[PDB]
């Protein structure tokens, strides 16, 4: 599963205990995140998900959703 | 660390003890004179005159928990003659011991002797 | 695959800026730092200049009261030599500790041999010596104490300043080896009143094969040199300046001075963490030296009832050391476990762990695990184990010794 | 305004001087055929004007600046009654004192050779 | 400046996890980790501006020591795997 | 655009094949060699007896023979005042010879003034010690005969052979410092009957800051160490062995053993060149030294009537050496050419020109051209040049000092 | 073998040449040149076989202190001009 | 190198010799005590007492021509008794001469000496 | 002039007094060079005219004419 992935690693790389990360949760409203833990949630989804994120491409991950959308595309 | 000493530390031979009280069984305890290895050795004697069981407990470096090892299994299957035949360079030979470690195999050959001492010791009348 | 390493007291790694820093003048600026005719000494005397205010700097001294040398080693045998021998005339009594390593009591005791008088103080179960023992020995004829900053073996830490107030007052040179110190806890020559420091380039993650000694200009000391010959180094150390490695000390002297305190901040949080886990799951454990005065990032405990050695060769997959006497090439056993009132049994039984700039969580946790299962799997193997089960004082036994 | 004070050379001669007040003891050893080297006369960066001064005198002198002291580091044969003759000058306290040439200098003459006056 | 702050962040990050020994490699990642967000509510440009240009050096340093320590490489750690 | 480099006497650059050999154990082989309890201390001490059986390769030794140092300035003190300490209590008396290096000569100074008989032996007009001068100078108290392969000055080579017999048939160790040596012309420990030699790292094309010293097992020689400590290098210079130091000498002496002979065929060459090329366009230049016993490495021209440190101004574009007073920090006349019969005015003129592994015909001529412009528009500057021009006789002049 | 050892010849001259520093560039160049001419006769297999490997070495070393040497290079000589 | 030396050195000024037989110029030609630096400037010195031409020729090192050079730039101009009052201080401040090369501002005064006292004999009856 | 550079680098090259270079003259038979010589030349070729030959094209190169075609013809 693909989305299962891509909210484990949010999980891990937040701390968000496994149950906040929904399909519509931000990562700097909803969730405790800056843009330096955004950065690095991004760089931490490119390990996962072999691929290299464009720097427009990562401006638009900001939700779980977008990551998944991204993640699922590609 | 040879390869030899390795395989006695790392698989020690007859690991445990014996019931001191039983007749039929000798305890040595030694200690080295210039370091703190110390050396508990048993051995169970039958009505033969043969050694059917041995156990040792070492506190010491690995060279001497290796001597130890190598000395309960040598000295199981002999008797007591034989096993007074056991020397130290017997010892140290086979696990290849550098001059600094000699004093393993000299405390090991110091515990051999002191249960079989203990062993007729104890066949006293 | 390869084992951790947790033997920093030993010797550290090279920090990558320090290696960044170097490489320069092992590729293009290779000429000779005394040439004082052409472009390649000049440039390499001003890189020596450079690395000789960074380690003043790091200190807080004046970079003209900086001399380099091959190491620690050397810098201890010049204080020492040095000193004793140039006020020969006057002044024929030295003081220091027990518990000082090596090249520090090997120089004594040359000295010794070569018709001078020397004292070796006792140390306190903490390992910190008595101020009022230290003033009670300073003699009239006394010409040099040296007292080392952070111990070695067992980290304790002296009272420094105090013991160079106490000097400053008795008119006596006050001499530190602050080879484990340098780097990892502040120094200030002056606040302490320091008359001479030795410094080790490979223990605050710099080069091999370089060192400095800190001499002080106001009021003059003097030393006589030990090395003849062309009269580098204001005539105290002949020889060719080795400009990489000096280069790479200045460099790691003004890292450490950056990171100082975010390393040693992360350093006492591990230590705590390795010393509570350790303490947690294993019964009678013992650390060598006091908490209060002690360096976090080396740890000495001791494990009773387990040979060191055994447990080393156990822990085969992590880089430690012991001061039993089975690790020694001459079955030495640890002064300065005997010094501070260690056992025997307990000396045999002692670990040393060393935590530094790059030792990770990751590490200390494996090291913890590993050492537990092997501490428990030696006790079930020990006999002095088996007879403390079975009330058996190990002080009473009549040990039957050849 | 006389100032006597004697120089020991490296034979162990004692050489007499009647010297003058304001005189400087590397040109006035100099004068009097004393064999100090003097090499740099008086710049202070060569340090073989390096003598040794009499305990009874060496504390009336003037003492050192740090850079006469840095100069008697690359001295050899240095002592604590050490000072470099050509940053000395004569007044009516020293009186008697005597200046003793040491046996090498900073410059290798081991062949023997004496450079000619300054 | 945010932006190219988080470039720069961005850029040491990637280059430091390309370290081949675990020592440097985990000690450059927490080390920048660690000193990006102490250096979070700086106020003055001077300092924002120095800061930036010591990265910029460092991040220097970090290209070619990795590149030299992927010349030299050696086995990994018993931890790694 | 930086200098032609032509002062390989003074130091060398390092050779990429020695760097490459030294950086793994700057990367990520960083234990310390004498930890004896776990893998990164063996293979460091494994590194570090690879390193020892390749110098001892190098000069015909068993590997048992060599003792790593800091540098020849210290294998040297070693030598002298180790074995004249040693043997103080019957020996008294040393020789060595007036054109050795600084670190030797301040040595036996040192020992003169502990009480030591020191004789230093003249040499011939060629820079050759006389053999029956030497046979005649042995007393029946002599300890040590100290004689150089090859000056680092002139170049020219000493019969150490010869000098080792005469040594072995009177019974008085012998050493030699090899630093300008090793690697460059033959040596064989045993064929020329040598007791002690010293050892360069950074002379033939290795680190800075290391060396070793040949100390011979049979028939024993022993030395006093000079650095006390924990008893390192069997006792004889304590303290850590810097293991990337000494891999990079043992790299740059197999490298010297494989390239030997090709590199002095290529140098012979070169300095042929050199010299002839010099010699046929300007007059009254004189080479320092006999070309009979010479290295041709190491060319000491004189350039009569024009002051050498101004020739050395006038090629800003190489990097060359003097023995001018005025070159010197503490204005010291040249006591090698001194010794040679050289007249002042002459040694006052004279350059060092280094031609080694690295060096190019381009270089040669580059550096031919440019002196040849600069010597004749500094003898038109020259008031001597002038009065020569004249007629009037230098020795004859009346100057006026003062 | 002459192929290979043509082949191995042409990369050790061509990366010998990108030598940043002019001592090492014209040493390797020449040092090449000279040792395989040197070596333009030899029969044995055995011998060709060992030198080949050698080479190989020695190539490996010559890539390596390049790439070093262009991390960090400098100026270059007066005579380069 | 200092700068103003190197210029001095690398540009001369008055770089040559003047007839000595003539009534109107002065040589002096003195050494250096402990290096083989050798001065010799030449002065010319018209009807009014004023010093007209200078020039100098030096074997010495780069600091000594310096000394030299200049020495001859500031005599031009000047007369006798202004020429008398140039020191070797002055030398050494505009040259920023260190320590081990005040020798070539001494020997450069010396030499200033010299010339004029040649010159004034000369014109004794 | 194309062909007279050629001719200038395969005389410097080889030695040959700059007027034994000739239309038809080989590297091996008519000039004095051996495959190393071949070697150096061709590198020297691509040296002074900026290309890069590969190794069917170098092979190909045994004669003047071979060098100077080719480089016209690239
Ligand atoms: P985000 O919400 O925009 O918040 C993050 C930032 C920093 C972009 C934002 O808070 C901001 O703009 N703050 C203003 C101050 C600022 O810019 N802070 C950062 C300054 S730059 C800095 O801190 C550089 C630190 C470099 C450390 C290098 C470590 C190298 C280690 C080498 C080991 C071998
Ligand atoms: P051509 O007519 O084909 O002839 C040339 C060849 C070599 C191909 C031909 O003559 C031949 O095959 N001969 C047989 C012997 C042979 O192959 N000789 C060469 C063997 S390989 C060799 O000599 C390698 C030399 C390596 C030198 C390394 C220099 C390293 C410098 C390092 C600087 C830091
Ligand atoms: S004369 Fe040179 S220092 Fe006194
Ligand atoms: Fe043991
Ligand atoms: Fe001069």
């Known amino acids: ?74 | 660390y040879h390869k030899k000493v390795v395989d006695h530390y790392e698989n020690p031979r007859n690991v445990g003890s014996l019931d001191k009280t039983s007749k039929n069984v000798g305890t040595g305890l030694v200690g080295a004179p210039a370091c703190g290895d110390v050396m508990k050795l048993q051995i169970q004697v039958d009505e033969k005159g043969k050694i059917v069981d041995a156990r040792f407990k070492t506190f010491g470096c690995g060279s001497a928990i290796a001597s130890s090892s190598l000395a309960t299994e040598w000295v199981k299957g002999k008797t007591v003659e034989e096993a007074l035949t056991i020397k130290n360079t017997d010892i140290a030979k086979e696990l290849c011991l550098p001059p600094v470690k000699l004093h393993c195999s000299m405390l090991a050959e110091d515990a051999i002797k002191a249960a079989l001492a203990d062993y007729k010791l104890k066949q006293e009348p | 695959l390869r084992p951790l390493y947790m033997d920093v007291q030993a010797t550290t790694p090279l920090d990558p800026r320090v290696l960044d820093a170097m490489l320069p003048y092992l590729i293009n600026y290779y000429g000779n730092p005394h040439s004082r005719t052409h472009a390649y000494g000049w440039e390499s005397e001003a890189a020596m200049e450079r690395a000789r205010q960074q380690v003043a700097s790091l200190i807080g001294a004046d970079p003209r009261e900086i001399i380099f040398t091959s190491g620690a080693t050397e810098s201890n045998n010049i204080a020492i030599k040095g000193v004793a021998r140039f006020y020969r005339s006057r002044k024929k009594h030295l003081i220091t500790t027990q518990t000082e390593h090596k090249c520090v009591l090997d120089s004594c005791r040359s000295l010794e041999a070569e018709g001078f008088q020397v004292t070796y103080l006792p140390v306190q179960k903490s390992g910190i010596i008595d101020l009022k023992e230290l003033e009670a020995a300073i003699q009239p004829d006394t010409s040099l104490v040296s007292v080392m900053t952070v111990n070695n073996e067992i980290g304790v830490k002296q009272p420094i300043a105090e013991i160079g107030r106490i000097c400053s007052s008795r008119k006596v040179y006050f001499h530190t080896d602050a080879a484990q110190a340098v780097g990892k806890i502040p120094l200030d020559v002056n606040d302490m009143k320091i008359d001479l420091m030795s410094i080790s380039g490979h223990k605050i993650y710099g080069p091999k094969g370089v060192g400095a000694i800190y001499i002080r200009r106001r009021p003059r000391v003097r030393v006589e040199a030990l090395q003849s010959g062309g009269g580098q180094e204001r005539g105290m150390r002949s020889g060719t300046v080795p400009t990489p490695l000096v280069v790479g000390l200045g460099a790691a002297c003004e890292v450490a001075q950056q990171e100082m305190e975010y390393d040693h901040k992360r350093i006492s949080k591990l230590s705590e963490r390795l010393i509570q886990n350790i303490m947690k799951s294993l019964p009678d454990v013992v650390m060598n030296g006091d908490p209060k005065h002690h360096y976090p990032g080396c740890i000495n405990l001791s494990f009773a009832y387990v040979e060191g050695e055994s447990l080393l060769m156990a822990l085969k997959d992590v880089a430690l050391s012991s001061g039993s006497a089975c690790t020694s090439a001459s079955l030495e056993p640890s002064y300065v476990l005997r010094a501070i009132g260690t056992d025997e049994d307990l000396a045999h039984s002692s670990i040393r762990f060393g935590i530094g700039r790059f030792t990770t969580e990751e590490e200390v946790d494996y090291t913890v695990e590993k050492c537990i299962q092997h501490v428990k799997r030696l006790r079930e193997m020990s006999p002095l184990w088996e007879m403390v089960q079975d009330g058996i004082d190990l002080k009473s036994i009549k040990w039957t010794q050849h | 305004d006389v100032v006597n004070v004697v120089f020991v050379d490296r034979s162990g001669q004692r050489i007499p001087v009647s010297g003058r007040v304001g005189d400087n003891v590397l040109h006035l050893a100099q004068r009097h055929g004393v064999d100090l080297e003097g090499a740099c006369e008086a710049s202070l960066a060569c340090s073989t004007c390096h003598v040794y001064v009499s305990e009874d005198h060496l504390d009336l002198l003037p003492p050192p600046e740090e850079r006469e002291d840095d100069m008697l580091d690359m001295a050899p044969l240095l002592q604590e009654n050490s000072r470099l003759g050509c940053q000395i000058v004569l007044t009516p306290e020293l009186e008697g004192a005597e200046f003793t040439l040491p046996k090498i200098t900073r410059n290798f003459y081991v062949d023997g050779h004496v450079p000619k006056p300054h | 400046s945010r932006a190219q702050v988080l470039a720069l962040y961005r850029a040491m990050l990637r280059e430091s996890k390309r370290f081949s020994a675990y020592n440097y490699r985990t000690y450059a990642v927490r080390r920048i980790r660690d000193a990006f967000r102490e250096n979070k509510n700086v106020k003055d440009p001077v300092e924002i501006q120095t800061l930036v240009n010591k990265a910029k050096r460092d991040l220097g340093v970090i290209r070619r020591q990795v590149h030299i320590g992927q010349l030299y490489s050696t086995d990994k750690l018993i931890i790694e795997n």
Chains 1, 9 share one sequence.
């Open chain 1, 1 to 74: 599963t693909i989305e299962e992935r891509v909210k484990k690693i949010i999980g891990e790389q937040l701390g968000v205990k496994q149950e906040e990360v929904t399909n519509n949760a931000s990562f700097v409203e909803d969730l405790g995140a800056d843009s330096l833990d955004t950065v690095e949630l991004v760089m931490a989804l490119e390990e996962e998900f072999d691929t290299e994120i464009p720097d427009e491409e990562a401006e638009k991950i900001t939700t779980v959703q977008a990551a998944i959308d991204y993640i699922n595309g590609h």
